Subunit: 245 residues, 4 copies
Amino acid sequence: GRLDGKVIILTAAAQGIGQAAALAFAREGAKVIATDINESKLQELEKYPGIQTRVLDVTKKKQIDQFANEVERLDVLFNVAGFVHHGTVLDCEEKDWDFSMNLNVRSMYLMIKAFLPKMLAQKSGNIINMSSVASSVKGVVNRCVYSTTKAAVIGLTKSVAADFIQQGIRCNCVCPGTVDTPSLQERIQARGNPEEARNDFLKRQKTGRFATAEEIAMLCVYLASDESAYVTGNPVIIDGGWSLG
Amino acid sequence: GRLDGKVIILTAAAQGIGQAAALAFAREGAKVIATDINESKLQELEKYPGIQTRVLDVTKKKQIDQFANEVERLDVLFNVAGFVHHGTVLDCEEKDWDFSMNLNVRSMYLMIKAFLPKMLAQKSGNIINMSSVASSVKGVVNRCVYSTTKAAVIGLTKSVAADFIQQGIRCNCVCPGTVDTPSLQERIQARGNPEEARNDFLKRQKTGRFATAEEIAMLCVYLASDESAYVTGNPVIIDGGWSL
Amino acid sequence: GRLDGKVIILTAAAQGIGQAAALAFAREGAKVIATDINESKLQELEKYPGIQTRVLDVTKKKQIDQFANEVERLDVLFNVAGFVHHGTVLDCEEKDWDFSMNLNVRSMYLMIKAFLPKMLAQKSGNIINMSSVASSVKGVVNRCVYSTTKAAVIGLTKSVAADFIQQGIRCNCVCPGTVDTPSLQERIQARGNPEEARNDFLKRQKTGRFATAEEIAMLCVYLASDESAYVTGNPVIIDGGWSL
Amino acid sequence: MGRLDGKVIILTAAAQGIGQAAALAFAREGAKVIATDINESKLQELEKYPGIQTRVLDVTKKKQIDQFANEVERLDVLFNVAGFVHHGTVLDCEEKDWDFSMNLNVRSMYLMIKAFLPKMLAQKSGNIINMSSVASSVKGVVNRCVYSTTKAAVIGLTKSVAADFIQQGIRCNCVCPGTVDTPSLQERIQARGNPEEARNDFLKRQKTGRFATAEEIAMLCVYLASDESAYVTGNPVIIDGGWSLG
Ligand SMILES: NC(=O)c1ccc[n+]([C@@H]2O[C@H](COP(=O)([O-])OP(=O)(O)OC[C@H]3O[C@@H](n4cnc5c(N)ncnc54)[C@H](O)[C@@H]3O)[C@@H](O)[C@H]2O)c1
Ligand SMILES: NC(=O)c1ccc[n+]([C@@H]2O[C@H](COP(=O)([O-])OP(=O)(O)OC[C@H]3O[C@@H](n4cnc5c(N)ncnc54)[C@H](O)[C@@H]3O)[C@@H](O)[C@H]2O)c1
Ligand SMILES: NC(=O)c1ccc[n+]([C@@H]2O[C@H](COP(=O)([O-])OP(=O)(O)OC[C@H]3O[C@@H](n4cnc5c(N)ncnc54)[C@H](O)[C@@H]3O)[C@@H](O)[C@H]2O)c1
Ligand SMILES: NC(=O)c1ccc[n+]([C@@H]2O[C@H](COP(=O)([O-])OP(=O)(O)OC[C@H]3O[C@@H](n4cnc5c(N)ncnc54)[C@H](O)[C@@H]3O)[C@@H](O)[C@H]2O)c1
């Protein structure tokens, strides 16, 4: 397996990209600690060899620190947790702004701050953060606070990469286009005409399809593996040509 | 003047880049409304033709909304306010993280959401945001929360530019290298050996100097003027070759 | 004027962006040496205070070297010459590939290598190169060799900027979206349905217009001026939200 | 089952360095590899490896290229590897240096793509990987004028092909390394006045205190060549050990 010997911790693992990653990591021989707030859905992964699960709300610092004190070592941290708000800056009220900033960015700060010292004591570690093309990468309509947080993810990634490169740490982030996940389906259904919302989303995608969560996972495998040891400080795009032009 | 007939509001105007921008706008014929929390320093600008002042804390939504209700129209909003925390992710306590996120990003969100509707009703407007090369542009050491916020600023910029391009709104951000401002001097002094600190900052700068606030201001003039009408959604770098 | 005391040499000056640049530089007090292969059109600029003209084919090293020897000093070199080939990689025959590489890229290399030593001896110089968003910035349809060359331009820009920063040289390039020039009109007319071709080009442009050459010129004035001394190594976008 | 099972892959400059490592890596992942180079005796060493067939090919010769293409029934992937690294500023670069690099580093790719793309279009499926560098439009690097210009041009060419042929099932990406320990890198070190010291300037780029191996570059090429990366197109993928980071 491409990840033999690796201990990997991830968040938001119960469905979507996190689930697919958890499964993909485990199949490649990793020791996976898969976390989510949704305990009943999460515990489904316990049936898969190589995966152990734990309930974790990434907005709760007390929860995070206690979890960190339980973990002996890790090789990889994959911060997946994030919410996609629909709206422009005018559509974003204070509670939407804060909710996204807390879940999407503060979460990563708290996870990295709890887990990075373990990596530093072993002079080795790898941190993968979930960003988006809707970010500093490009402008995307109706995604104000999302794009703002997802840009923030890139800043945080490059910061960590620069600060700890000489202590054996790498840090990268993943920037997908549209991925067929349960939340995407929720966002389609939430529209006034879902039949039509599905077509706006496909418009971005000149190949005529969304990415699968598995495809996103296989990039995370590459970035988790020693194959990519020489890759750090990058937003890796996986967008089906959306940001291309 | 290159900014004649323009009504420009800007924050953090009492010193540094804000101050230089205020004075540069005014010299180019703008009607400037220059805001800061520091009332005594801010009110020095009152002596300059074209500048009117108002005390404003950009972290206070209530103050922001009241200010907006006072303003009949604008052409340009320049979000300048921001703090530079020194440290890695490990040096950043929750208080540091939240203070920076509130002043550096939330501020912009609240200012934009208050003033943008004005611009939309006139089908015209221009929002300039202060970012930095310490951001999504490149990795800079001991600047964790700062870089995170300044990246957020680029995301917010591109978002606003994308959402309101068809309603005559432009949005760009400015990404300096090291600029000789009073806060920069504070950061130098704050280190263990301020001699040595000054040389680390210069190491960034292969031209052997920092930028002046007036130089940053002249970029802001270009971006504020109709000369740059066709420029939107960009992080404009002004870094003396640092990110090169 | 904003360019008072600057000696500025430019290519492809007889029409389009070059022409607008020349007139804009002259209006701001520059001493302009405007060059082009089209002698009769070029000579029109002679009537404008501050512009002297010289015929120059930028694909002819021997002409370039002899021109350089005529020139005592410069402050700015503006490489404007470039041709826009229509087609994919499959539409591009060896003749199209080579013609574009030589005019669009080799030209810049020859002008730079002939004029840069002057700037090095003054310990001061500024090189502006015309790029495009159709380049390494973004992928654009039916622009294969063009995009290849305009990418090459960014490479060359950043090279020169990195190599000569400590000797007082700056180098940047300009990356437009669609600009309403005579060659753009020629490209429109050259299509099967020019009525419909005008609309494809417009679809690029969410503000519903092309840039004017004057607008591109004003970016060039900013980049040519000492106002922008701290700006080097950048591809400056001016695209009306196309790459956004 | 290898990650490249069923894939027919053609590459250039396969006899040493990145190209060699890639050929070997593609073959071990179950690709059918057609490995080409100008250096016949060295290239022929790869014939002992299961899955690799070799052919002499000078990528500056249009006539050679078209005849080779006429020999190939199908391909899934084209990896354009050939490129020379000139040492010097714009001032150090004479007409012959400029032209030599432009023809090998860029014209070569144009000709290979123009010969092979029609095959991929006819199958409504193809993947083109181009070798670029961080010394390019990505960042400014000293003493690399014509190299950086060509490797920028590669990125422009990559995005053009990706934009033009996306709807016909074609992907195009490029790879942008920092310093890779290859034989030509060793040549460039040895060619300096003090090779001990050239070696340390190259290491200065590299905050991790090492160069990449050709193998490491290869494994990125495996990912980009595989269907795992089917949703990746139009990108310069950086693999630079933090060099462009800051
Ligand atoms: N799906 C896409 O089109 C797409 C595109 C780009 C980026 N992303 C990013 O990928 C990541 C995952 O999204 P997805 O769509 O694959 O999954 P999703 O949105 O379908 O699932 C989210 C998961 O996160 C969990 N979660 C919610 N709040 C949490 C909290 N406080 N703590 C811990 N877990 C929590 C949920 O229980 C759920 O299992 C997000 O960061 C998202 O921004 C998604
Ligand atoms: N090297 C540099 O100085 C540099 C480089 C890149 C970007 N920047 C950015 O430029 C912007 C201005 O920084 P500067 O160093 O020119 O000025 P500075 O930091 O010296 O001045 C900051 C000003 O902001 C005001 N201020 C502080 N909190 C406020 C609040 N809550 N509400 C309203 N005003 C408040 C202060 O009273 C002061 O007048 C910042 O966003 C900074 O991040 C500076
Ligand atoms: N027009 C646009 O939409 C647009 C967009 C992006 C970039 N550009 C770039 O701007 C530059 C100028 O294009 P434009 O469209 O403004 O002008 P244009 O194409 O209308 O005019 C070109 C000028 O170049 C001159 N010229 C041609 N060959 C020459 C040679 N060998 N030596 C010297 N001069 C020569 C011509 O005589 C003419 O006066 C080009 O590099 C072009 O790629 C144009
Ligand atoms: N530090 C690095 O080594 C580094 C970094 C970034 C990018 N690259 C790129 O990787 C590619 C390979 O370089 P490398 O250093 O791994 O290998 P190399 O330079 O050691 O070997 C080059 C190979 O190309 C072959 N070759 C030369 N001319 C040819 C021609 N006309 N036709 C066909 N083959 C020809 C040679 O015989 C040799 O086998 C180049 O494009 C280079 O620019 C290398």
